[PDB]
């Protein structure tokens, strides 16, 4: 019972924000590697999961829960398992500031559920093959969608709908990082372009090819390979955002 | 080094001169005992005097206290909402600085928002001109600037959004002091403003939100426009200040 | 009561114990040690009281009351601090059983009205005189103990306690002669339960029981009345003091 | 803690029961915070049910242990209502601590959790409707409270402010039902009390929306027998922990 | 809660008999050597240093640094008691 | 801790100082002066104009008590008690997320609907503990028939008005819970049963331990004293509630 | 200073039991040497798991065991009355009489009390086979132990005892076996056949209490076979004994007077502990009992039922006690108190 | 050591079985116990 309550969700979040901050520097093609070193091994890998996640992080029984839930993404829905740990980390990092205002965790979970419904309700508008165009562009066409619908919610969920918008823009901000670009400047200079000219394909060019238009760079994401990230991450937050105690005899 | 600690020894000495004046805002404002050095303790609910006699001693604290004086020599009755504004703008600038953007960008984007704020607080106005006080001229600012921060590019549309989110403080304090749930009523106020209502706001006598303007206090523009102008001037002056040098 | 009518009884106990033995024809000197050289031996209760700085308001009130009685009647001034330390010592045994001070004050002030009925009855003319030694105290005690057999109330134990508290005057007139206070006081009780033996007291110089109509000790019934009144009034003026608080004026 | 004999021991037992309930409180309701209890083998168990949390919890305090045994006994035979029982028990204990700090004495607090509980099960068996059902989600603890306080106002003696505290101690089930959903309890409970004063003997907390709702019409139902058994078991657990005066720990 | 301390408590019933008897015994053991012929003088050095052979009771008890207050008493009462008889101290103290 | 509980504790301290000398039969207090000149007195009207109060909340409470005393020369020691009890219960309310303003609005409503029912108890007011134990039940019924955020500040204004009947019975050695609950069980069948409407004069007796009819026994109290006391205790509680910070200069 | 450490331990031995005297006695959680929580009301089982090690207190426990094997009840009387005896002796030794002067005073007062008792008996057991006269009369023994189903257990034990009973006495308390079938439903208990009570509890921790209550029950039937004389229970006989002993002490002169009056005030500690365990104020009820016993009611005792201090006749109410069970109780309590009053300066022994 | 209490008002059983710390008193008891078996019982008066 030691450290239970709304001070146990600042520790659970500091724990699930460590396994995410490490995986935050490996998203893009320019993803900086890590070194596998155990009793015997010198593997250098940047991929995900078993290659990174499930060979480390035995702490707080919650990093073990992120890595326990990310096994559902890989082997099973393509291999998009770095985007779900970074997205879960971002959602919890915004929940950290939503809790300080005094919003009950269940309320934040319902807000994330509504926002994920809106996002997945917006990704299926951009099936263009089965396929959602964009390296960093799918998470900026939804963040723009769940930001508008946010102000159409009269309850406390509106704050959670906006935090979900602010956290969906972390995928196209570790893509700006991990390269020689500025995260905020680049993420916004392409977010202000999906508005003022309707093209959700505009995204970050992690490779410096030169065109911020993922429709022609031919960098694609399978739709069910994005309907999972937005869903499996929310179903991971709503499991880490709702447990109130870790008792260890 | 010194810049990144004298932009956080002023933004934490002005944000502590605002959270000593905050719950004295409105008709149902909580009082605050004032402990004089001699020992007698007086009770007042007006933020003007509490700032008047405070022994601030801090550069930014004085910059914020001399803001109340400017606001009551320019408009008369804004002397504790303008301090709350210019202390929450700095609260937002505390997070905008950890992101890593430069203070000369959160100083040219506030004047990029204040100039739009001027054109939002002159549309609500009923030309006599008067604006629907009570919390409207700030929830409308937040909503309209957030709508307008989506049409802006670069680092600009990241501080204007912080401007909007920092506007939702006077409605929060008015709702708290009125015995409401601040977050829930602020969300309901925003959802009532997006649906068209621009006269909305916390009616503190009834104890809740109201649209009918008969018992919804109306204030001149000069007070709200002056509050925005002077608060943005003061936060621009505080942001572009490092290295307090002793001559 | 609470720790205020038990911190006023320890002050009264302390004051009584300081002078308790300075009573009788067989008085016992005390040593008064000044700051510089000190010793001055005196068996006079008043001086001992007028020279010790007590600083406690309860003790300051017992000293004050004693001085007033001394400058009013003269004799019977060390039998007032006693019977007020003794009548308070017995009060504490009921303030420990959760008995409100109002109840004991309603018993003390009730015992007094019966205390001054036998002094009027055991007196002899030429005003009147009352048997000295311990005879007057044991007679009053026995009278109250016989009047307390028809009380049928909760203020019945504090009634007998006052009665048995008017025995510290014989208990000290026997202790200063070297005799055993127990084996002799029991004999006094036995003598006083008879018909005419209401004047049997204690020979203050030999330590034996003598009929005071044959030894010739008699005290005027105006220093035995003011003594009892002042004792049972300083016993209900220190029992109804619920708090000792600051005061500015 | 003193925990010697009498008031100190009773306060100690009350605090221990408060702790053991506080470890399950958030689990109450349909949607309730989970708990991550880990055994000695490194297994992570996430379960939002009070039964499976007390059977996996180290009870090393005597009063807490007796409360947990009564809760497990309720869970074994009845099933439903193994966290509401311990919640009601710990709340009954929490709301007589301010009266047991004085010399009110437990023997009298015990002749207030047995008259009031018998009366409340009478009221349940009289107000239940048809197998017999009563509206859950509050709507009973918000009615049994109104009935018990309105009846205690007509009691000359010490049981007035003990039944009136028994009644006030029933409002926790319709309270943490909405405190778990995050519904600003001090408003929904005020509405429930105001709506139970006039009428509405079946109005309880709604979980789909932050407002009171007639819980009989909304078909959120609870078997009368189950509620009676839960109330009696909670009251008996309270009386047990109130009827304990010392802990005689054998030296060996 | 001003002034709630019952001070001034020393020397109860024997604690004072013991002290006074020990003081009298010490004063006896100081003057015990000066009694009778074949006795023993004492020095009595002042502050300036004026030594004074003073074998007797009066000049001794009246001029020596007697620390114990009880012995100081016994000397103030014994000195004032040998001017009606001439000289009988050093036997009184013993 | 916050500086609202400190003001509540200061008011409670001055209350506990005065509240054991309330009724006609009430123990005294001793007010040690600077030099030590002690004055032993009940009648808190003086204990409040002689007490050394330094805390600002205790000071404001003393000021409003003396204001009431000079408005009407009675009911100045009950104002302090009712005000401190209001403050205790209001602190218990605020400590469960009830803003001091909702509690203040509740106290205003209660003090305004209590003097509009004392004008159904007036003839003078029965006195004793009748009006208090009647307003208790009336307000506990009027609160629930409102259902606002302040429906809980009228039921803590009704259970905190019975501090006068609850301290008028420990200053009479009778009881605290039993006597007050027989008082609040007679006044129930004066608002529930229309036949026994003359049970609204049944206050409590300070001689015997049983409630009697304080209209057939002449223990009245002028209505303008009870109304003024409720109207000044309410303002005192409100004044000490509307402060929430102590600014150091 | 060494006879006060003994008294100050016999006190603390009597305070952990005083609170479990009447039918409203408290109910403490006695952790077993095997760590098995059986919260029990019986205050003879408390001593088993308390294991008092202070030798002065151990003698009062030995007297309690003597009372537990000589008769079957009064185990608390033997160590809530001896505790009062010593508490008042310390209140009397400080006056300075001596250990010697209060022991013989207590012995005189105990000899007196054993001659007052046969004049306090007010009922009998005319027919020890009439089943209502064996249930309604054996009620008090269980009522004091298990308040609640006092009459059901009374009848169910009356059946067992009356069944196996010869025409001459020879009641065997070891004949009545007690099964403990772990069923459910107290009412389902019955008497099979030497007899046996099946005693179907619910959790094998609320029939162990019933098993001890059955022990105390049939133990009252055994003593009822030896002495039919019954004395009023619930403090009636205690207050009457205290009154008459106080009178005797007032007549008798000498130093024994104080010890005799203290023996009476030690008898008043039974209804004081009877009332203090019910919420009512003790002084109120001791005064209301002494004032009705002075008129000569002789049978009125504590009214456990009411909330306020109340008095009630105990003959017409049927709350009686057993003569032998109090004769032996007073005897053993006096013998225990005077024993640890003698003992001074508890020395350690030499390793054998 | 086991806890067998023994009311023992006499000189022989006392001096012969009690923990006498002081060595000199241990002597006086070893010499007084061995001196009351030729007379029967006269201790408790010897030691005094
Ligand atoms: N050529 C590219 N240009 C821009 N973004 C890319 C490119 N290739 C992949 N991405 C983006 O990288 C992210 C996937 O990171 P990745 O390392 O593939 O994670 P995982 O280990 O889960 O496969 C997606 O947001 C995807 O859109
Ligand atoms: N009747 C009212 N209802 C709602 N808000 C009000 C009302 N009157 C003033 N306000 C709010 O109070 C703020 C003005 O600050 P104020 O506290 O009046 O300064 P001062 O401390 O000088 O009185 C503005 O936000 C205004 O909207
Ligand atoms: N010769 C005597 N024998 C016995 N008692 C005496 C004798 N002379 C005086 N007393 C008693 O001594 C008590 C106190 O006398 P004393 O010591 O002079 O002081 P006080 O002023 O208190 O009387 C009185 O009760 C008095 O009767
Ligand atoms: N759909 C619902 N709406 C409102 N209240 C509910 C609903 N379902 C259950 N409850 C309430 O939640 C309380 C707790 O029930 P739950 O925790 O689910 O199982 P248990 O009764 O075993 O604790 C019950 O008292 C019930 O009244
Ligand atoms: N020459 C002597 N031989 C024997 N005894 C003597 C002689 N001179 C004096 N004494 C004794 O010594 C005793 C004590 O005398 P001392 O103490 O010296 O002086 P003081 O006579 O002043 O006390 C006297 O009682 C006296 O009898
Ligand atoms: N004789 C009496 N019997 C019952 N109650 C009384 C009696 N006298 C006064 N009271 C009650 O005691 C309360 C307190 O009055 P008190 O404190 O003595 O003076 P004040 O009126 O200044 O407070 C009053 O409200 C009054 O009703
Ligand atoms: N119903 C009752 N009302 C009042 N006093 C009772 C009642 N029943 C029993 N008593 C008294 O309290 C005692 C309780 O028995 P208990 O103390 O448990 O047994 P023991 O005599 O072995 O200590 C009875 O012996 C009797 O003196
Ligand atoms: Mg990939
Ligand atoms: Mg203003
Ligand atoms: Mg004299
Ligand atoms: Mg369930
Ligand atoms: Mg000579
Ligand atoms: Mg008055
Ligand atoms: Mg028994
Ligand atoms: Mg011999």
Residue numbers in the entry:
A (entry chain E): 26 to 154, 417 to 536
B (entry chain d): 28 to 155, 420 to 538
C (entry chain g): 19 to 144, 405 to 527
D (entry chain H): 13 to 142, 403 to 524
E (entry chain z): 4 to 97
F (entry chain a): 15 to 137, 408 to 533
G (entry chain Q): 27 to 219, 372 to 530
H (entry chain Z): 50 to 97
Structure paper excerpt:
The chaperonin TCP-1 ring complex (TRiC) acts as obligate folder for >10% of cytosolic proteins, including he cytoskeletal proteins actin and tubulin. Eight paralogous subunits (CCT1–CCT8) assemble into a hexadecamer of two back-to-back rings, enclosing a folding chamber. This architecture facilitates nascent protein recognition at the apical domain with a built-in lid, as well as binding and hydrolysis of ATP in the equatorial and intermediate domains to drive lid closure for open-and-close conformational transition. We trapped endogenous human TRiC with substrates (actin, tubulin) and cochaperone (PhLP2A) at different folding stages, for structure determination by cryo-EM.
Beyond the closed states, initial 2D classification revealed TRiC in the open state (open TRiC) for 10.7% of particles. These generated an open-state consensus map at 3.5-Å resolution, ranging locally from 3.5 Å (equatorial domains) to 9.0 Å (apical domains). We built into the ordered map portion all equatorial domains up to the ATP-binding pockets, which we again modeled with Mg2+–ADP–AlFx, although the ligand density for CCT4 and CCT5 subunits is less well featured. We then used an open-state map filtered to 4.0-Å resolution to model apical domains to the less-ordered map portion by molecular dynamics flexible fitting. In open TRiC, a substantial portion of the N terminus is disordered in most subunits. Therefore, unlike closed-TRiC, the pre-strand coil is not available for inter-ring contacts and the N-terminal β-strand is missing from intra-ring sheet formation (which is now three-stranded). Additionally, the inter-ring plug-socket interactions seen in closed-TRiC have now disengaged in open TRiC with a rearranged interface. The rearranged intra-/intersubunit contacts in open TRiC indicate that the septum structure at the ring–ring interface has become more dynamic and less constricted between the two cavities when compared with closed-TRiC. Indeed, our open TRiC map revealed weak substrate density at the level of the equatorial domains, surrounded by the less rigid septum. This density is positioned >30 Å deeper into the chamber when compared with the actin and tubulin positions in closed-TRiC, occupying the same site as MLST8 substrate in the human open TRiC structure.
